[PDB]
Design a protein around this ligand. Sequence first.
Ligand SMILES: [Cl-]
Ligand SMILES: [K+]
Length: 144
Amino acid sequence: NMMECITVSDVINVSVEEVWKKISAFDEFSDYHPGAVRSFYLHQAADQQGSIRRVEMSDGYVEELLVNIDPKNYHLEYSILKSSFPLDGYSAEIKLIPVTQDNRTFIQWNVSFTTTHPSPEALVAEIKNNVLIAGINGLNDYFS
Ligand SMILES: [Cl-]
Ligand SMILES: [K+]
């Protein structure tokens, strides 16, 4: 019943334009996330907003809706429509801010959800380390 909330932020050594280009490509999630086997569009929108992707991982699957995107502010919000995981009301958020010195990128990844999992502290630690931290480090390895 309690609303979980995770916030992970780091600095990737790559320009903000190149980070946004890969992140705004909604279906290319599996290219840089090591836990995602495949990722593709179920339905794609011309204005990006409203696109639905499917991310297949080693545990289960996930189908997410792109609820809002703002290229001028490097802001991106998406939520889970269907999932084989005990994630109810899941919503995620990505915010990029340029780092002028050496032209890097400040990434901030926030998620919020409610779960019926009996051990939620282990579930929030699983998402924080193996989804958010692993995804940021994966984006850093993708641009190596
Ligand atoms: Cl959020
Ligand atoms: K992968």
